[PDB]
Ligand SMILES: CC(=O)NCCNC(=O)CCNC(=O)[C@H](O)C(C)(C)COP(=O)(O)OP(=O)(O)OC[C@H]1O[C@@H](n2cnc3c(N)ncnc32)[C@H](O)[C@@H]1OP(=O)(O)O
Ligand SMILES: CC(=O)NCCNC(=O)CCNC(=O)[C@H](O)C(C)(C)COP(=O)(O)OP(=O)(O)OC[C@H]1O[C@@H](n2cnc3c(N)ncnc32)[C@H](O)[C@@H]1OP(=O)(O)O
C-alpha cells in the first residue's frame with residue numbers, strides 16, 4: 001500500500017535511492033539517510049513509500065503563479081522486479097492526491113530524453129513536455 | 144548595481160514579470176504583487192533586481208544529495224531596451240554568488256527549446272542540457 005514516509009523510514013528511502021543510482025551507474029554521496037531524515041522532518045517535502053519496493057520524493061516550492069506551491073517529483077522509482085504491475089501508477093496517483101492537499105498549482109518532473117519508458121509513462125498519466133508549442137528543456141550546473 | 148529585492152520591491156518585481164509574460168503572450172495571474180511580497184519575505188526564495196529593468200527569481204528546495212539546497216532560476220528577464228549590454232550576464236553571475244551563500248549544490252533552469260538565443264546565453268555561462276549523453280526534458284501538469 002502507499003504511505004507517507006516518517007522520519008524513521010529514512011533508511012528504506014535511502015536504500016531505494018541507492019538502488020536507483022546503482023541501476024544507472026551513478027555514484028551517490030555519503031549521508032543519504034541522514035539527509036532524508038532531516039528533509040522528511042522539517043522541510044516542505046515528502047516521500048511516499050510503496051512497501052519497501054518503490055518511492056516518490058516530492059518537493060514543494062513557492063510560485064508567484066499560484067497561492068499554493070509548485071511541486072516537483074524529484075525522484076520516482078520502483079524496484080525492477082516490481083515494475084509493470086501498477087506500482088508506479090499508484091505512486092503517481094498518490095503524488096497528485098497529496099499535492100492537492102497543499103493546493104499545488106502544478107507538478108513538474110525532469111526526465112532524460114533517452115528514458116522513453118518513463119516518458120511514455122508520464123505522457124500516459126497526464127504530463128506534457130510541451131508549453132506554448134515548444135518542448136521544455138532542463139539546464140543545470142553542478143556546484 | 145544588482146541588489147537582493149526586499150518586500151518593498153514587490154511592486155517592481157510584479158511589473159517586470161507582467162511585462163515578461165505580456166511580451167511572450169503567456170498568462171498573467173492575479174495578485175502578483177501580493178504574492179511576491181509573501182515570497183520575498185520567506186527564506187526559500189529570493190529575487191535579484193537590476194535597477195528596475197531586469198530581475199532573476201530563484202527558489203531553493205531540499206535534496207538528499209547535498210547539505211544545501213537545489214536552486215532553480217524560475218524566471219530571468221531583462222527589459223527589451225536593455226538587452227545585449229551585459230545585464231543578464233550580471234544577473235546570472237549574482238545568482239551563482241547568492242546561491243553559493245546558501246551552499247546550493249546545483250542550479251537548474253527550465254528553458255523552452257525554441258528559445259535559441261536564451262539557450263546560447265546559458266550554455267556560454269556554464270549550464271548544460273546534457274546528462275550521460277542524453278538531453279534533459281521537463282514534463283509538467285497544470286493543476
Ligand atoms: C528503455 C527505458 O526507458 N528503461 C528505463 C529503465 N529504468 C528507469 O527508467 C528507472 C526508473 N523507472 C521506474 O522505476 C519505473 O519505470 C517507473 C517509471 C516508476 C514505472 O513504475 P512501474 O513499472 O511500477 O509503473 P506501472 O506498473 O504503474 O506502469 C507502467 C506500465 O505497466 C503497464 N500497466 C500497469 N498497470 C496496468 C493496467 N492496470 N492495465 C494495463 N497495463 C498496465 C503499462 O504498460 C504501463 O506502461 P505505460 O507507460 O502506461 O505505457
Ligand atoms: C528562467 C527564465 O526565465 N529563462 C528564460 C530567459 N529569458 C528570456 O529569454 C526573456 C527575454 N530575454 C531576456 O530577458 C534577456 O535577453 C536574457 C536572455 C535574460 C539575457 O539578458 P541580456 O540581453 O542582458 O543578455 P547579455 O547582454 O548579458 O548577454 C547577451 C546574450 O543574451 C541573449 N539574448 C539577447 N537578447 C535576447 C532575446 N531578445 N531573447 C533571448 N535571448 C537574448 C543572447 O544569447 C545574447 O548573446 P549574443 O551576443 O547574441 O551571442
Ligand SMILES: CN[C@@H]1[C@@H](O)[C@@H](O[C@@H]2[C@@H](O)[C@H](O[C@H]3O[C@H]([C@@H](C)NC)CC[C@H]3N)[C@@H](N)C[C@H]2N)OC[C@]1(C)O
Nearest residue numbers: 065106131163164167169217218253254255258283285
Ligand atoms: C505552466 N508551467 C510554467 C513552467 O513550465 C515554468 O515555465 C518556464 C518559466 O520558468 C520561464 O518562463 C519565462 O520565459 C518564457 C519565454 C522566455 N519563452 C516563451 C516566457 C514565460 C516567462 N515566464 C522560462 N524559464 C521557461 C518557461 N517554460 O515556470 C512557470 C510555470 C507557469 O510554472
